Design a protein around this motif. Structure first.
Motif, PDB file in Angstrom:
ATOM      1  N   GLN A 183     -16.149  -6.528  21.206  1.00 38.79           N
ATOM      2  CA  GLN A 183     -14.702  -6.471  21.427  1.00 38.79           C
ATOM      3  C   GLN A 183     -14.073  -5.267  20.722  1.00 38.79           C
ATOM      4  N   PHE A 184     -14.535  -4.949  19.510  1.00 38.92           N
ATOM      5  CA  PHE A 184     -13.974  -3.839  18.757  1.00 38.92           C
ATOM      6  C   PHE A 184     -14.520  -2.492  19.205  1.00 38.92           C
ATOM      7  N   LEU A 185     -15.680  -2.485  19.860  1.00 39.74           N
ATOM      8  CA  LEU A 185     -16.374  -1.235  20.163  1.00 39.74           C
ATOM      9  C   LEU A 185     -15.525  -0.205  20.905  1.00 39.74           C
ATOM     10  N   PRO A 186     -14.722  -0.549  21.917  1.00 44.04           N
ATOM     11  CA  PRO A 186     -13.868   0.497  22.511  1.00 44.04           C
ATOM     12  C   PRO A 186     -12.945   1.142  21.493  1.00 44.04           C
ATOM     13  N   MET A 187     -12.409   0.361  20.556  1.00 41.79           N
ATOM     14  CA  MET A 187     -11.553   0.953  19.535  1.00 41.79           C
ATOM     15  C   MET A 187     -12.346   1.766  18.522  1.00 41.79           C
ATOM     16  N   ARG A 188     -13.580   1.360  18.210  1.00 40.20           N
ATOM     17  CA  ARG A 188     -14.436   2.219  17.392  1.00 40.20           C
ATOM     18  C   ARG A 188     -14.678   3.566  18.075  1.00 40.20           C
TER      19      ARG A 188
ATOM     20  N   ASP B   9      -7.301 -15.959  10.665  1.00 40.05           N
ATOM     21  CA  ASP B   9      -7.277 -15.137  11.872  1.00 40.05           C
ATOM     22  C   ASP B   9      -6.303 -13.964  11.787  1.00 40.05           C
ATOM     23  N   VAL B  10      -5.149 -14.133  11.135  1.00 43.00           N
ATOM     24  CA  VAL B  10      -4.028 -13.194  11.228  1.00 43.00           C
ATOM     25  C   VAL B  10      -3.838 -12.518   9.872  1.00 43.00           C
ATOM     26  N   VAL B  11      -4.202 -11.233   9.785  1.00 38.15           N
ATOM     27  CA  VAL B  11      -4.244 -10.523   8.514  1.00 38.15           C
ATOM     28  C   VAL B  11      -3.693  -9.109   8.663  1.00 38.15           C
ATOM     29  N   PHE B  12      -3.270  -8.541   7.534  1.00 35.13           N
ATOM     30  CA  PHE B  12      -2.913  -7.131   7.418  1.00 35.13           C
ATOM     31  C   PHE B  12      -3.631  -6.598   6.188  1.00 35.13           C
ATOM     32  N   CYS B  13      -4.165  -5.382   6.259  1.00 34.17           N
ATOM     33  CA  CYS B  13      -4.887  -4.809   5.126  1.00 34.17           C
ATOM     34  C   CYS B  13      -4.292  -3.456   4.773  1.00 34.17           C
ATOM     35  N   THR B  14      -3.818  -3.315   3.532  1.00 29.38           N
ATOM     36  CA  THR B  14      -3.197  -2.063   3.123  1.00 29.38           C
ATOM     37  C   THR B  14      -4.214  -0.959   2.914  1.00 29.38           C
TER      38      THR B  14
ATOM     39  N   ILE C 281       5.954   0.160   4.617  1.00 31.79           N
ATOM     40  CA  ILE C 281       5.833   1.615   4.686  1.00 31.79           C
ATOM     41  C   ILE C 281       4.694   2.014   5.621  1.00 31.79           C
ATOM     42  N   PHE C 282       3.526   1.390   5.454  1.00 32.83           N
ATOM     43  CA  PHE C 282       2.383   1.686   6.313  1.00 32.83           C
ATOM     44  C   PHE C 282       2.707   1.414   7.778  1.00 32.83           C
ATOM     45  N   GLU C 283       3.459   0.344   8.049  1.00 30.94           N
ATOM     46  CA  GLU C 283       3.883   0.079   9.416  1.00 30.94           C
ATOM     47  C   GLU C 283       4.772   1.197   9.936  1.00 30.94           C
ATOM     48  N   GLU C 284       5.635   1.743   9.078  1.00 32.31           N
ATOM     49  CA  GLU C 284       6.435   2.895   9.490  1.00 32.31           C
ATOM     50  C   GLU C 284       5.553   4.097   9.809  1.00 32.31           C
ATOM     51  N   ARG C 285       4.505   4.318   9.014  1.00 26.71           N
ATOM     52  CA  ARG C 285       3.622   5.451   9.268  1.00 26.71           C
ATOM     53  C   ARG C 285       2.729   5.194  10.472  1.00 26.71           C
ATOM     54  N   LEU C 286       2.227   3.962  10.617  1.00 31.85           N
ATOM     55  CA  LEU C 286       1.467   3.623  11.814  1.00 31.85           C
ATOM     56  C   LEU C 286       2.292   3.890  13.068  1.00 31.85           C
ATOM     57  N   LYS C 287       3.596   3.603  13.007  1.00 25.41           N
ATOM     58  CA  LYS C 287       4.448   3.816  14.165  1.00 25.41           C
ATOM     59  C   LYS C 287       4.671   5.305  14.410  1.00 25.41           C
ATOM     60  N   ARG C 288       5.041   6.048  13.363  1.00 22.65           N
ATOM     61  CA  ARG C 288       5.294   7.479  13.502  1.00 22.65           C
ATOM     62  C   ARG C 288       4.076   8.215  14.056  1.00 22.65           C
ATOM     63  N   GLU C 289       2.881   7.881  13.573  1.00 22.05           N
ATOM     64  CA  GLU C 289       1.668   8.581  13.967  1.00 22.05           C
ATOM     65  C   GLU C 289       0.988   7.953  15.185  1.00 22.05           C
ATOM     66  N   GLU C 290       1.636   6.963  15.816  1.00 22.86           N
ATOM     67  CA  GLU C 290       1.184   6.352  17.072  1.00 22.86           C
ATOM     68  C   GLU C 290      -0.201   5.710  16.932  1.00 22.86           C
ATOM     69  N   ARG C 291      -0.363   4.889  15.895  1.00 20.80           N
ATOM     70  CA  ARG C 291      -1.655   4.292  15.579  1.00 20.80           C
ATOM     71  C   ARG C 291      -1.569   2.777  15.410  1.00 20.80           C
ATOM     72  N   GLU C 292      -0.480   2.163  15.867  1.00 19.61           N
ATOM     73  CA  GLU C 292      -0.307   0.723  15.698  1.00 19.61           C
ATOM     74  C   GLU C 292      -1.429  -0.064  16.366  1.00 19.61           C
ATOM     75  N   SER C 293      -1.778   0.278  17.612  1.00 18.20           N
ATOM     76  CA  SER C 293      -2.798  -0.522  18.287  1.00 18.20           C
ATOM     77  C   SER C 293      -4.186  -0.286  17.689  1.00 18.20           C
ATOM     78  N   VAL C 294      -4.427   0.896  17.117  1.00 20.97           N
ATOM     79  CA  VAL C 294      -5.640   1.116  16.324  1.00 20.97           C
ATOM     80  C   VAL C 294      -5.680   0.178  15.118  1.00 20.97           C
ATOM     81  N   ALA C 295      -4.587   0.116  14.359  1.00 20.59           N
ATOM     82  CA  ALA C 295      -4.591  -0.740  13.179  1.00 20.59           C
ATOM     83  C   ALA C 295      -4.769  -2.196  13.582  1.00 20.59           C
ATOM     84  N   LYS C 296      -4.029  -2.631  14.606  1.00 23.33           N
ATOM     85  CA  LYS C 296      -4.108  -4.018  15.047  1.00 23.33           C
ATOM     86  C   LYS C 296      -5.546  -4.406  15.379  1.00 23.33           C
TER      87      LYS C 296
END
Ligand code: CL
Ligand code: CL
Ligand code: NA
Ligand code: NA
Ligand code: NA
Ligand code: NA
Ligand code: NA
Ligand code: NA
Ligand code: NA
Ligand code: NA
Ligand code: NA
Ligand code: NA
Ligand code: NA
Ligand code: NA
Ligand code: NA
Ligand code: NA
Ligand code: NA
Ligand code: NA
Ligand code: NA
Lengths: 205, 206, 206, 203, 206, 206, 207, 206
Positions: E184-189, F97-102, F165-180
């Motif tokens: 599931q993660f592989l496309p994002m990797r 299941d539902v986590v955020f990692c700084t 703050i990281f969410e603000e940077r994830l948004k600015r750099e267009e990486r939210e779906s990567v982080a998710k």
């Protein structure tokens, strides 16, 4: 601290009618074929030093080189492997009677892996060698006073170091071992100049 | 032909060594002289024959072999004499001091390769193939096998010839006095190993 | 020629192990006992025959084999028992205590090499060619292949003869009480691995 | 106010060591016992005082000290006993049987850190500052040398008591005991030529 | 022998890929997708035949191939899909996200070895000898030599069989949901690599 | 004021955690969950207060805390959650299941540095000096020291602000779906650790 | 084997075989260190299937015909890893060529699917050819070179013309011609940097 | 302390850059030009003043700056120009031809040290303490801080003086033609980086 500064060579050898002379050099770096000899420092061990500026392309230094080749005078270095290489490369004359405090340290200070001159001075003499001017422009036409003072202090203490190391070498019965190392050291410096500077010639591989 | 004289403890005499240079090599239980005893000493005069002397555990003397090793008028030829000198001096109490080392000589002349093992040198300089298959075997066995006796003898059979070629190379490249200073220090380099500096290049900056 | 008795779960009895030393080896799905289950236990009495015991996933007991492994009057011979003791204790809850390890013994006597693997030792000490092609296969397969059965058996067929030689060498080099101390600690060394110190030399300075 | 008794060669007698466990440490000319001689042996009963014994070059005998070292009813406490046992046995020919090592103990209990030096251990367990700042073969030791030498045995009893509490709590006592039982042979292995070899490693 | 259909640019139709799962592989001018263009895409249904599709420099679309890659009802089988997904997504702008990777599956099941290359897996699981001589060649050549098309085809011929075997192993060792999450993660990797994190284990502590 | 509530075993109730996201951290006896037990769990709602919960040896349940950990409508914020999820799941049997990692967020946004520790991140993003002195202390002690309690609490006091703050940077750099996607995989990355792949980048080529 | 090979002493007799656009060049030495390890042989092929093998003597300082060829701006000098040959050629004769082509640089710019860029590996892949590197370890300073030595040294230049052509095709295809040209232009100074004392230093690296 | 003009997007004109040589520095989100965008460009004429130009995300044009960068009568002075050239050419599509690099100059002249960073160079040659505290800050922020602005301006303020001193040493040691050739290749070295060779010393044997 009397430091006598010279252009090219000693004026004469009146201060060097002695058994053993402390010798040190300054250069533009560690590679003799690329990095020229800039300064040669000498001391009789009387608390004074001579600092001799070597000019670019200088071919002779008759009084200094007479000292270097006088077999009745031991030349004392800290890591003479380096100094003997650039001196022989510059003036064509390789000393053969030498004492090295860094080899001596490695034969006697078996309780540490720090054999730099700064560490040796601080430990055996409680003398604080400041290594700040080590990386400076030693080719400068006029040396700063801090440069002159740093260059002189690298020779001021080598006689006292030699005496203490000679005591330790005798106490641990390593005198003949050290002598053989000092006997080979000019050839180890020659090997460096001929192209073996990166090779422990005695290693298995 | 392949003449190998096997001896117990010592040479019976020095009749075969009225010469100016003897090839020498040893076999041991390993690389650590304080732990791994000397087991064999191999000699050759260069005449195609070899002498193989089995050394007993706890043996402290071998008067004929030690006279040869002590003889300042006889050059002792080794490959990597740094090793052989250390175990020989540690076992019998005498350090030879007129020596020639084909490995140092190779490092001073075969400047186009990082391979200075005796097997490589024999292959390139003489087209003789040396088999190192018995190098790791029980050299302490009471009776050595035939493969063991032949491997040990072949490690000294060729050193005279290698020395001649390296001497030509040292002359051609004007490195004779360099090589001689290295050989003059080698016995003390071996003493440094016995004394506790075997892991240390004594001339290195750090 | 070689007789190999294959069993499911346990030996049927101990009729073939009224002896003073038994060779033991294991096969697994890998090197991490908490992840990689024990798949096979191999035993030999030293008579050129072997028993190969398939261990099922989740198998917690094997009474006859465990009695063998608990019998203090019977020395368990391993090659690198550090591994086998850990997986055996992890699986059956019993840590064997009276052991001999040919790899420690090799490291204590074969001081002329750094190759202490079982295949290396069998070749030099016995002139016997272990093949290591089946070491990397699915040892958890419901039916072991002929090749797998053969390989597993051969890893215990020679441990008695290796032990007799190493014992002679330990006597010769006067290292018997050293070896006995190492074998005494070895179960605790294996316990240390299971407890979480498998990556740590507990005796190192750092 | 720390009493330190300095001796030449040996303890004069064992009147201060009628005890169950003794703290032991050494000073040498280096880490290689075949080259670097024993220079100093330090002892403490745990009562806040220490004995500092100067070992002469070539010295074969130290009857009172060595009696202590081979008394199986007295536990010898060390920090990294593997080193001290090697140089002691090499020098006087007697390998102690009954030992306790705070470095091994630390490695079995202080699983939350990667620093197991005595200085690090004292700082954390006892809030004591060891200073590790020489020529231990000098005819006369300096005051600083005498004080450094003593300070390396003044704390081992207290360290041992705490480590025993942690070994008990984490149920690793029998593991520690087996490590201590093997430690003298581990030091012996070093003197025989296996100092660079983890004898239990696969490779 | 092996029936291999060679195409320019795209599959001529989808008539041979009305299947549940397709084996996919690629050839490139190297490992760096921003520098090294996609040169060949290989497919197979697992029926012993393969399609080999030559990709032109600057080619931006491949309608029939990309239809497959976008099809959610069709699992895409790769060996080390991390690479193929990166270059497939970079070239054509579509990222598959119903995938199976035999290298991840091997690392999850073949816990008795550290060799997870396709050639190694093919030899053990199927007794099939993948030859890797053509791996380093000019995949951008106008005409591919028979050696290249045969090598390109052999990398997809066996992925269906390997997937089946790994799915049995994943079931046996109860790691199916672990394998699924990694797939599931592989496309994002793969995306992480294209975005600039190809030298970073994003989950490592340091 | 920094009010820190210390509990034995579990929260008394969840009255302070009727919130959308909770800051979580743990203390242990070391980095190896199979050997080094959970000692403390720390929680904060982000209101400047913290709860520090002492976990006893062999404790099997913590009903209120574990309710929080499995409540999918509450995001669990960690710094390097890979570690905390592993020991929490290993202790109480429940993997969130539902986590955020700084730390992952930092690796995705602070591309100008290779220092992603909490202390470094707090210093830069919030100008908050975290002291790490108590990090290596006896966390299994019956009574924690005041320095220990304050250190434990301060590892959760700032995670909400970092997340913002990281969410603000994830948004600015267009990486939210990567982080998710990274956050979605993180529980399975921690599970892979417990199962025996802690030293393996499962996505690496080799 | 036995392609035409003309073994010379010291220099070429003339340049009659070298009125061409590009010449293939290679050297043999006593090692990788020009200040210690002397130039022993220079090898040349015009690409016509033949080769010239020139013995260089110890202490020799001129090769007027050879050096005229190396100095000729209209004649490209083709090497494999010219960084080495340019250094030892410049060191021995005092003249540094500066119109050069290097098949190792070109391989590093085109063979991006591999990390094996030695001449052996290039010839096997591009030409299906074996360059038996067995004589690489021999006495290149011998008075009389062996037939085996002469043919190994000759074969290291027989292929450089064909390799240049294939690589220029690849540089055109991947649009890297101006990149390769810049690398070739700096190469003589990269060789000078080595002679002057920076042989261990990537002069462009951050550290 | 020193006059700093802060600009949004571009210089307003080139009134302050009718000069022979301009000092240039950039700030970015990191070291990877494909991932980490240009954030700030800093300029100085050598008169004690600096211009700090904020570059927007997605910004394609900076006409006055880029006019400067392609003016071959103006030498562009950098410290480690390999980096700045890469990000500048990548951002605006224009690679300067005529450059001087103080780090290459340092590596060719300060042969008595192995530390060639700008901080170390300023320390030794000018007795100037460059503060590197603001290296780890958000250079992409909408509004820079005064500490950010001042750190950005500090670099370029010394480059003219360093150039003068380095040219004196290059003349003294007779290395001017060496340096000119390195500076002439430097733009292609930065181009090689953008093209995919950033990790490759293109001139090395291996
Ligand atoms: Cl005892
Ligand atoms: Cl949840
Ligand atoms: Na000196
Ligand atoms: Na000096
Ligand atoms: Na031999
Ligand atoms: Na030898
Ligand atoms: Na075994
Ligand atoms: Na086995
Ligand atoms: Na001590
Ligand atoms: Na006694
Ligand atoms: Na100690
Ligand atoms: Na693939
Ligand atoms: Na492929
Ligand atoms: Na914490
Ligand atoms: Na955490
Ligand atoms: Na060449
Ligand atoms: Na050549
Ligand atoms: Na900057
Ligand atoms: Na810069």
């Amino acid at each position: 601290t009397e430091i006598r500064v010279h252009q090219g060579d000693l004026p004469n050898l009146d201060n060097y009618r002695i058994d053993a002379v402390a010798v040190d050099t300054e250069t533009l770096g560690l590679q003799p074929h690329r990095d020229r000899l800039c300064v040669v420092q000498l001391s009789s061990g009387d608390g004074t030093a001579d600092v001799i500026q070597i000019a670019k392309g200088q071919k002779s230094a008759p009084n200094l080189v007479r000292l270097l080749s006088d077999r009745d005078i031991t030349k004392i270095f800290h890591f003479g492997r380096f100094d003997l290489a650039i001196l022989a490369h510059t003036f064509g004359v390789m000393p053969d009677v030498v004492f090295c405090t860094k080899i001596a340290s490695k034969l006697t200070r078996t309780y540490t892996d720090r054999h730099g001159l700064k560490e040796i001075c601080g430990e055996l003499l409680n003398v604080n060698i400041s290594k700040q001017q080590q990386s400076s422009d030693w080719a400068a036409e006029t040396l700063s006073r801090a440069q002159i003072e740093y260059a002189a202090s690298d020779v001021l203490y080598l006689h006292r170091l030699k005496d203490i190391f000679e005591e330790r070498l005798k106490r641990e019965e390593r005198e003949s071992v050290a002598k053989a190392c000092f006997q080979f050291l000019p050839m180890r410096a020659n090997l460096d100049l001929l192209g073996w500077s990166e090779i422990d010639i005695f290693a298995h591989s």
